[PDB]
Symmetry: C2
Subunit: 167 residues, 2 copies
């Protein structure tokens, strides 16, 4: 009885990592860092921020360590940003710090996707209704948190696709 919700989640998150593959395909350093205005986000920022949001929030509900630190991606990126920064609330001067090659942007997201698939494989209705304690009143259910991740990441991955065109 849990297969239907598991499949919806697996498919939705798969669409995200598929987009990462399209966006990083042939993605150069210049194009990845391009910003149409000094306050706009770059492709590199959108890929990094999406992966961070998914990693930190999936790891939170799964009760495990984020891939970012567990496998040393934070050190491979070497960003001049706090160690657990996700990009939420960044100012333009923070956006400019997000500099990483396409293969690192893709490798990190693929590791986040593997973590995500592992968590979804054990999804139950009971887990989807579990309340998740966060600092943001109100708490939310696992289901709402997962939907929030897909919605945020799909929006940003869409923005990155639009950027590749308008550049």
């Amino acid at each position: 009885t849990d297969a239907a919700a598991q499949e919806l989640l697996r498919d939705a998150f798969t669409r995200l990592i598929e987009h990462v593959d399209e966006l990083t395909d042939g993605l150069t350093d210049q194009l990845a860092s391009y910003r149409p205005t000094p306050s706009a986000n770059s492709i590199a920022w959108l890929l990094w921020h999406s992966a961070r949001v998914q990693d930190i929030q999936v790891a939170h509900v799964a009760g495990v360590e984020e891939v970012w630190t567990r496998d040393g991606w934070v050190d491979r990126f070497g960003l001049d940003l706090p160690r657990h920064d996700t990009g939420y609330g960044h100012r333009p001067e923070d956006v400019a710090k997000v500099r990483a090659p396409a293969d690192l942007l893709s490798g990190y997201y693929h590791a986040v996707h593997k973590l995500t698939l592992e968590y979804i494989a054990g999804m139950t209705a009971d887990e989807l209704s579990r309340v998740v304690d966060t600092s943001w009143n109100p708490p939310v259910t696992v289901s709402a948190r997962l939907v929030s991740i897909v919605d945020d990441c799909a929006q940003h991955l869409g923005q990155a696709a639009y950027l590749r065109g308008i550049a």
Copy 2:
């Protein structure tokens, strides 16, 4: 036992209509029709196309009429485009034909949202596994079709929010 999958879908589609409300606040015709480059999509196009894709694809799987025609939104818009056009495959000159006030862009999407929630409210595991395209490889199920809609619409609504910020 269908509640969990119904809730994932209800929540995901609700996020989309919330984005529509944010995007149409303060959306003048100059802003709605703005294209950052001569060929780029406008906010109006992104709102209209997202609603059209969701309407036509949900109406198809649900076996009901699209609200675009059922309630005469197509006539209120009065676009110089075919009656059933969704914008898929539009050329730059076709994108320019999508012009409508924010109130109509929002009103149509809200009608599409209502239709979508009505279909979700009856959704079952058996329906989610029903094959809607036997010719594709792999064959397309209702579940995958719905995920495709959320993913396309979330991407485009994200693009619209990005454009609003760079205008």
